[PDB]
Design a protein around this ligand. Structure first.
Ligand code: NAD
Ligand code: A1IU2
Length: 344
């Protein structure tokens, strides 16, 4: 019985991916330090306790920090892993500008320690959950895997790019390593049960949490940062992927490892961007509520449009996103109605 290690598996994308692993016939072991996840009333995170109910299957779980070398060494002795899916990290773009050293420590030192322990136990199969912010500001659209990387505008994006480079160098040095790097933008929606979803976040990377709070009556109006961009309706165009489609993409990457693929890089996305006004309109339709907005000045450094081309993932992973904007909103709204303050 070889297992799949999911780091950061209590969090938003991780919990959905643990569910998809169980549905695809894998045996998951999760590690998390609860930096940004909710504890349940027993040993499991609440997200994972609910995953067990949804699937009828067990999730093994260890509370630990990826920065703890001794804890990681013990973990790889206790369990026999075939692969690792790596989500443990800090990910709030706005926070990374204020506290860059925390981002570099957790993301870079954590990942380096993970890679070293993997090597030491002969586990040379990795899915790395990257960010399409590694492309920097678009030079052409949609962004494909040939687009320049490294022009990054904030410490979070830099940390993701640096990790990618370290993995590419590892794979150059040892051709027996297989690693899939997945680049995407903004996860939204929730499992269709409504029982798991994104918990309330301190510093969101996208507008949908704010929109969801306006719709339930906890904020007055969405601030729209600029309506004079070179876009169809003047508001910013951004890339949103349903978290369930994203989680399935991570399973497709895991399967690709078995082909002895070496180092591969794929974008995940729907292939179409959505404006601020489109997102507002879709949530109004899903929720049946009015969502007031106020146009304010642009945020310094924002671009008109940014979205990814997912064509390579279709060709080489056999993967497409099936769930569109209306479904993202419907599934988000269901999670909010059933869990207005998240797991708490
Ligand atoms: N949410 C996004 O906007 C987005 C976009 C692109 C990529 N990502 C990537 O996805 C991953 C997770 O995203 P998410 O949105 O599910 O966030 P999340 O915060 O919900 O999940 C990350 C999990 O990692 C845990 N964690 C953090 N530091 C840890 C540490 N030192 N040791 C152990 N566990 C630790 C947190 O407690 C949390 O449960 C990260 O790799 C992130 O860079 C996120
Ligand atoms: C590309 C883009 C995004 C965007 N708007 C957005 O993300 N808004 C969410 C945050 C927000 O409204 N904050 C806020 C509101 C009121 N008082 C204080 C803070 N506009 O363009």
């Amino acid at each position: 019985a070889e297992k799949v290690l999911v780091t950061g598996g209590a969090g938003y994308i991780g919990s959905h991916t643990v569910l998809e692993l169980l549905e695809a016939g894998y045996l998951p072991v999760v590690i998390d330090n609860f930096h940004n996840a909710f504890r349940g009333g027993g040993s499991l995170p609440e997200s994972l306790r609910r995953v067990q109910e949804l699937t009828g299957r067990s999730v093994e779980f260890e509370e630990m920090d990826i920065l703890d070398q001794g804890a990681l060494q013990r973990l790889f002795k206790k369990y026999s892993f075939m692969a690792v899916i790596h989500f443990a990290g800090l990910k709030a773009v706005g926070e990374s500008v204020q506290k860059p050293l925390d981002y570099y420590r957790v993301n870079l030192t954590g990942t380096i320690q993970l890679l070293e322990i993997m090597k030491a136990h002969g586990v040379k199969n990795l899915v790395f959950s990257s960010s399409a912010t590694v492309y920097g500001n678009p030079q052409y659209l949609p962004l494909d895997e040939a687009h320049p990387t490294g022009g990054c505008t904030n410490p979070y994006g830099k940390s993701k790019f640096f990790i990618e480079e370290m993995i590419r160098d590892l794979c150059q040095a040892d051709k027996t390593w297989n690693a899939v790097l997945l680049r995407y933008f903004n996860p939204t929606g929730a499992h269709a049960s409504g029982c798991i979803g994104e918990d309330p976040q301190g510093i969101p990377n996208n507008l949908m949490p704010y929109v969801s709070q306006v719709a339930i009556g906890r904020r007055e109006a969405l601030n729209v940062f600029g309506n004079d961009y070179d876009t169809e309706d003047g508001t910013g165009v951004r890339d949103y992927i349903h978290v369930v489609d994203l989680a399935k993409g991570h399973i497709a990457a895991l399967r690709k490892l078995k082909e002895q693929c070496g180092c591969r890089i794929y974008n995940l996305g729907t292939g179409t961007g959505y404006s601020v006004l489109q997102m507002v309109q879709a949530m109004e339709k899903a929720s049946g509520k009015k969502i007031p907005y106020k146009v304010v000045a642009r945020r310094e450094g924002d671009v008109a449009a940014c979205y990814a081309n997912p064509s390579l993932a279709q060709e080489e992973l056999g993967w497409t996103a099936a769930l569109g904007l209306d479904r993202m909103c419907e599934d988000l709204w269901r999670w909010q109605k059933q869990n207005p303050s998240g797991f708490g």
